[PDB]
Subunit: 247 residues, 4 copies
């Protein structure tokens, strides 16, 4: 049987890509392709079982309520998710169990692994730094992922000593951005797409985890994994991490 | 209140380093340093709680027997553990269920983390390769660790297609050593010590884990870790990994 | 004034690309676009001053004679260039001075620099190795460039001791392909395009030069540089290196 | 037949290392080791040909005066060379045209090569950045070498547009220190020594030069090189680079 995948924001960048990806997938059939303004009833009309939603922060809450109200599983890449947005989703889910919602900030599997690996490694090293590298058309430095990683690292190293640093003389910015006591350096280079390197060190050894996103469509295999696996965990899951089944 | 640690093979290379390390540790008390011929009863006379044993394969079994018989936890870095010898350690332990033995081939935390990460990432990528790089005085290519690593990766990827590879024409060796369908390349270069890169790739993303050991004594933190935490797992633990408490 | 660029093999992969590149270039005008079977007279009919030729090894010698006979400068990426082919070109050039021919195996500037840098660095280090990384659809291992680099390195280190190597036990292929005493390792990985790393080492330090070709169209800026600069040196030039004006 | 080398500041850190190195060298004869207060005439009494001087800025000028006056070639690693002091060395040399003085701020061959390569590549790439990585006991960020390097690159790229950079929103420091419009990021990490990456990028290709110093004594080969070759360039040479004979 084809799993019946609906895509919201299907003319949006990510949705159109996902529509294509569902087409190509042997196990998935596209049950409905909706973009801004399409009645959500088209989803139930077509017996959608799971929806990919990468719409705007301003419609996703509309979408989710309808999806949960109707027992349609949701793989959500839309951002703007406050704790007040989150609880609302869990509130909606109370009334409909056996409905799985995934909200994840990042669907590139390599990125999710790296962040996971960084989390696991953090407490074992004296030093941790993040170097992030992106194309020079990038507006924010450091990237969200780098900031997300550094904060993860900081939390993992709670109650450890700070990164050792004997710097007493410096040019401004030499030491990167300080995100919760973790230096984050942002390289902007023509030729690059999205890259991130977490470096850990202790006298005697270092450990580096490097993730390279070479395509704009890196998220694809992860969204697909999320779609395939989403029913395995009822209720709300934040982050793609758990669906990777890491043991 | 501080743990009373003893070291067997204390005049051997690793042994002497560990004595120093334990002397140097603020939370650990050296209760015995033995090497060849020193009666093991020195350990019980001095109220030893945990032992580091990096001694020879030919003496380590008798050490273990005594250690287990006496409720002394053992951190065992000495090699030579056949299936039979593992089985024998297990038997001795049956009689002593509160005693903990950790037998591990690698105490470098970064190398242990790196292998765990390789293992957790292996199934998510079309392609996986190991590059190891050592000083040019190394007899064996590839390193034990790299081989162990490729085996782990192969084992983790069972049921996935082999590494895609269109190679039709090659110079012998270009594609490296085949360890379980996983290419391992051994770089031997002046100026290096011990280094390993694990490269995973899929269309649109790569993930790289690099471990660098800059010291021959990079294993000391792991040994001290094993020594501080060994008692948490009654019985035999194989590999340091379970002690790292990876969630 | 527009420099008048003709492209041979204009429906071929490289030619069509070059036609596009000439169009976009403010200083270049396409004077003639010829592909298999177009009479070369179209070139002189359109007052071509310089031709890009990435045709087949079986027509390039036809093309060159005509180009030199007619004082048309030639930027040649076609392969199959024997010393007997080379001399023929210089023979043809005798009769027409103030006609510049460039035959280069590689027009990616980053690749040409790397090879140059490798040449310069080679004699200063005890060890040199090449690691080449490519997409897994690649037929030859190691790549031509890697083999070309290793041979360059070997020549630069003539009368130096061999790479130190104490290996006495190994799996087959662990140490790479041996190209003139330089190990060449070939990684084939999904996600990769064309990458090459030359590693140099001496006790106390290493030096690595890494080139990444992320596009299929990497050669473009170099072919263009060659086109722009080709008249500066009369007669035959083999390799893009000299036109880079390195001091 | 072997060169007679003397070392000034022979009880200083670098001095003593050089004495050992010269003792150890098969082609070099130690003809004098001096430090504080030893009469410079020891050098001429012992038929010294070349001197290594790594002494203090406050004594190096008097050393040089004597060295030059006596036709003794000088390899000068001591720092503190103002424009005036350079000018004064030049004057002394006028009277002694067969005498050679090499004053260099960096004797690590790999670091000198790397800087030369950066310089030769700079003009060919839209984007250039320096990443340096040191042990976490380093007072100054970025390193002198990295700063020197960025300055070199900037200088080499004059007349090309600045690094493309769309950064509009950033945490202070993310983009690193600006040295002449070239970003330099300083990584401080336990387990490291001295490391520098120069990253060049253009649409479709990147080039990376990485130098790793694994030792505090990685400069010894360069100093021995300078000592064996200094006489080839009469007069003052600044930087080791010209001595490397880069063609
Ligand atoms: Mg389908
Ligand atoms: Mg102690
Ligand atoms: Mg044009
Ligand atoms: Mg000597």
């Amino acid at each position: 049987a084809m799993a019946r995948v609906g895509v919201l924001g299907a003319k949006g960048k990510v949705g159109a890509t996902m529509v294509r990806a569902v087409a190509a997938a042997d196990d998935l059939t596209l049950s409905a392709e909706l973009d801004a303004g399409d009645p959500l009833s088209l989803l139930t009309d077509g017996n959608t079982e799971v929806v990919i939603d990468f719409t705007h922060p301003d419609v996703v809450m509309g979408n989710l309520e309808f999806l949960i109200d109707n027992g349609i599983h949701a793989v959500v890449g839309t951002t703007g998710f406050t704790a007040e947005r989150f609880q609302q989703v869990e509130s909606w889910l109370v009334a409909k169990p056996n409905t799985s919602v995934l909200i994840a900030p990042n669907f590139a599997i390599g990125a999710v692994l790296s962040m996971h690996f960084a989390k696991q490694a953090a407490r074992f090293f004296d030093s941790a730094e993040v170097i992030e590298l992106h194309h020079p058309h990038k507006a924010d430095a450091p990237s969200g992922t780098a900031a997300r990683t550094a904060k993860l690292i900081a939390e993992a190293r709670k109650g450890l000593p700070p990164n050792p640093d004997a710097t007493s003389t410096s040019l401004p910015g030499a030491r990167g951005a300080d995100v919760d006591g973790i230096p984050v350096h942002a390289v902007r280079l023509a030729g690059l797409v999205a890259h991130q390197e977490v470096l850990f060190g202790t006298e005697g050894e270092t450990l580096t985890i490097r993730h390279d996103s070479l395509d704009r469509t890196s998220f694809v295999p992860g969204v697909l994994l999320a779609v395939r696996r989403i029913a395995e965990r009822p209720g709300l899951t934040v982050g793609l991490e758990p669906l990777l089944d890491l043991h």
